């Protein structure tokens, strides 16, 4: 595979900008947690979790792959192939499973608002939910990557390249694809729909002067939380859906109807999401607009 | 993509040969492999759109295919005497010659 000198020079330039953008963007997000201790909230920690994954896609996953698309050869031994594979499959399903968790936390904040108020500053509870997520994420692809070769009596991946030993196993790929896509997509759809109905109901609720007046202010806040969640959920959906959907389709036509370069394009769209998130946090959240101010332009006092 | 399609052909015919039982199937599969190999040898790999035919990379690409054609011809020799088992065993060696020498350039 690979590319002529002229094409590698244009792609390397572009691959590099994406690296710098992803790395700087998520370092800046992590440094804002340092600057502002008001970001010590469960919701905020769930976003910090997304920024860590994103940092690693930039610092680790894109960089090791660059030389491999450009030249067609993995030059790092199968050992480092397995580690890079584990980490790329891990950061994918972790981002997905963390969007689920963020969506749940937002659903509880609108639908269970008074119970959520007491729990919100509990970051120990938050950090333990994110850890469980890292283990659940690992479990889906982690062991299969590390163990398939010995279960199958040796590798079917020539020493040239770097693929999951299950990557032309359609049976494994259909059940991993459908879980990887539907678990997150149906859970996330449900929470967001359920936030919409909750707000619509309370909006059509008939209350007296102070209760009504207290709850249109609380609905203004819920409506904002719902936009915030829709925007990030949508932009993730549109970065992640092509790759998740194409895998389901590759596995169900046994690799005969999906060209390699379709799914390889989709990698960059999914990895590009890691550059985008850093910009969405302050677009969509006060708490992040506040933190970035405390860090970059604290002159606002 | 004619190089992509000639590689396609090498794959399909190599699995027929694992799967076969008589000399005619093995023979036809190799004659196909051979044609595809000679065709693929005349290709310019995408990697190399910008290189001379006297380029070390382009000489090496073409030498990979000399190994391959020659190995297919040894296996034709054996198939063309009804030695189906030898000719099938020799087909395995094609996989080595493909990965070690040619797959780099795809
Ligand atoms: C402007 C910057 C920040 C964005 C970077 C975009 C670059 C890194 C992305 C956008 C389009 C991507 C290309 C789209 C499609 C393919 C085909 C695939 O078979 C190999 C990778 C390749 C060639 C991608 C390489 C990386 C790529 C060029
Ligand atoms: C074309 C050069 N080789 C490749 O692109 C290989 C295809 C490869 F096995 C691969 C790596 C990682 C994944 C999983 N990634 C999860 C996030 C985007 C894709 C694959 F599905 C496939 C790397």
Residue numbers in the entry:
A (entry chain A): 27 to 241, 347 to 432
B (entry chain B): 1 to 106
Question: What do the authors of the reporting publication say about this deposited model?
Answer:
The action of histamine is mediated through four subtypes of G protein-coupled receptors (GPCRs), H1R, H2R, H3R, and H4R2. Therefore, H3R is a potential target for the treatment of neurologic and psychiatric disorders, such as sleep disorders, Parkinson’s disease, schizophrenia, Alzheimer’s disease, and cerebral ischemia.
To obtain the stable human H3R proteins for structure determination, the flexible regions of the N-terminal residues 1–26, intracellular loop 3 (ICL3) residues 242–346, and C-terminal residues 433–445 were truncated, and a thermostabilized apocytochrome b562RIL (BRIL) was inserted at the N-terminus. The H3R structure consisted of the canonical seven transmembrane helical bundles (TMs1–7) connected by three extracellular loops (ECLs1–3) and three intracellular loops (ICLs1–3) with an amphipathic helix 8. In our H3R structure, PF-03654746 occupies a shallow pocket at the extracellular side, with clear densities for both the receptor and ligand. At the extracellular side, the carbonyl and N-ethyl-carboxamide moieties of PF-03654746 extends into the EBP by forming hydrophobic and hydrogen interactions with E3957.36 and Y912.61, respectively. Notably, the fluorine atom of 3-fluoro-cyclobutane of PF-03654746 engages a hydrogen bond with C18845.50, and the amine moiety of pyrrolidine of PF-03654746 forms a salt bridge with D1143.32 at the bottom of the pocket, which is highly conserved in the aminergic receptors. In our structure, the electron density of a cholesterol molecule is observed around TM1 and TM7 of H3R. Especially, the β3-hydroxy head group of cholesterol interacts with E3957.36 through hydrogen bonding. Our functional assays showed that mutating the negatively charged E3957.36 to uncharged alanine or positively charged arginine had little effects on the histamine activation, while completely abolishing the PF-03654746 inhibition, indicating that cholesterol binding to E3957.36 might not be critical for agonist binding and H3R activation, but might potentially to affect antagonist binding and H3R inhibition through an allosteric mode. Indeed, the pocket volume of PF-03654746-bound H3R (calculated by the CASTp 3.0 server) was similar to that of the doxepin-bound inactive H1R, but increased by ~3-fold in comparison with the histamine-bound active H1R, which is in agreement with the expansion of the extracellular binding pocket in the inactive state of H1R. Together with the intrahelical salt bridge observed between D3.49 and R3.50 in the DRY motif, and locked state of Y7.53 in the NP7.50xxY7.53 motif, these conformational changes resulted in an inactive state of H3R in complex with PF-03654746.
